[PDB]
Amino acid sequence: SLRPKLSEEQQRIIAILLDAHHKTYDPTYSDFCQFRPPVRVNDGGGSVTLELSQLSMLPHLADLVSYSIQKVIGFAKMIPGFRDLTSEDQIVLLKSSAIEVIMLRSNESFTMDDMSWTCGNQDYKYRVSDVTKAGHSLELIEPLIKFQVGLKKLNLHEEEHVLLMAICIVSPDRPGVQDAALIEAIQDRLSNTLQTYIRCRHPPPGSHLLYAKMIQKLADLRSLNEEHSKQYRCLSFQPECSMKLTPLVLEVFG
Numbered sequence: 300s301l302r303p304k305l306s307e308e309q310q311r312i313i314a315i316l317l318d319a320h321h322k323t324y325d326p327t328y329s330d331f332c333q334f335r336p337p338v339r340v341n342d343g344g345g346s347v348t349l350e351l352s353q354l355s356m357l358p359h360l361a362d363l364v365s366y367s368i369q370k371v372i373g374f375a376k377m378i379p380g381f382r383d384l385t386s387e388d389q390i391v392l393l394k395s396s397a398i399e400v401i402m403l404r405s406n407e408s409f410t411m412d413d414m415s416w417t418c419g420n421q422d423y424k425y426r427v428s429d430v431t432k433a434g435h436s437l438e439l440i441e442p443l444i445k446f447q448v449g450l451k452k453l454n455l456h457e458e459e460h461v462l463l464m465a466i467c468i469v470s471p472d473r474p475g476v477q478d479a480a481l482i483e484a485i486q487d488r489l490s491n492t493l494q495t496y497i498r499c500r501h502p503p504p505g506s507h508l509l510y511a512k513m514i515q516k517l518a519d520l521r522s523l524n525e526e527h528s529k530q531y532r533c534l535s536f537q538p539e540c541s542m543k544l545t546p547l548v549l550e551v552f553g
């Protein structure tokens with residue numbers, strides 16, 4: 300019923316997050332040519348043996364993800380309150396949410412036209428098959444695609460998109476956090492901003508119920524995170540795999 304207006308601070312928080320995102324997410328994907336080149340071997344049969352022997356798309360996707368983790372670190376440092384946390388808690392939050400924020404931010408390149416992440420010409424269009432060529436299986440990929448479509452359908456305003464990523468990163472329920480109280484205080488400030496924004500800026504149908512759907516996406520990410528971790532583990536058993544990854548990727552998922 301009640302629709303309180305966004306406070307001055309809440310307006311500032313949103314402005315800061317929008318700016319942070321615009322500075323860390325290049326909608327033209329102009330840096331991609333700097334990554335090791337994508338290579339797509341003939342694997343129409345989806346052979347795990349072949350996929351693992353070649354890992355043809357791993358160097359490229361590993362670079363794409365490493366590059367993205369760097370952008371996410373930059374985004375997080377601009378989240379109001381994040382710097383108030385200890386560097387130790389900052390690193391714990393970053394490492395545990397990295398893959399989740401990547402999945403969330405990737406929704407901007409994802410398209411329902413053909414269910415792919417389109418980041419330019421054909422070379423930088425990623426499909427389910429490109430992900431299997433990087434050593435992952437459908438157990439992760441299919442739920443990931445479902446998640447992307449579910450997120451697209453929420454038709455989030457950019458304001459809601461950046462707030463969701465911030466809330467995802469500043470979660471008090473991450474293993475190893477020391478000052479959960481502070482982290483939760485910061486998250487609540489963000490969650491209240493989102494709840495308030497939805498109530499007085501998001502037109503129906505969806506003026507309500509949207510918050511719950513967004514929180515549910517965060518739960519969905521936890522599942523995807525666990526499945527990715529399990530699969531990364533398997534991938535790391537492949538001899539010479541480390542050279543196809545990056546130091547940052549090795550640390551974050553190691």
Ligand SMILES: C=C1/C(=C\C=C2/CCC[C@]3(C)[C@@H]([C@H](C)CCCC(C)(C)O)CC[C@@H]23)C[C@@H](O)[C@H](C)[C@@H]1O
Pocket residue numbers: 357360361363364367401402404405406407408409416418425430433435439443527531548
């Ligand atoms: C990164 C991005 C991105 C797309 C994301 C994709 C497509 C290719 C596969 C990938 C990277 C999956 C894949 C399951 C993760 C595999 C990583 C390793 C190999 C380390 O286990 C997670 C998100 C998805 C492009 C831009 O949106 C932005 C630049 C974003 O940030």
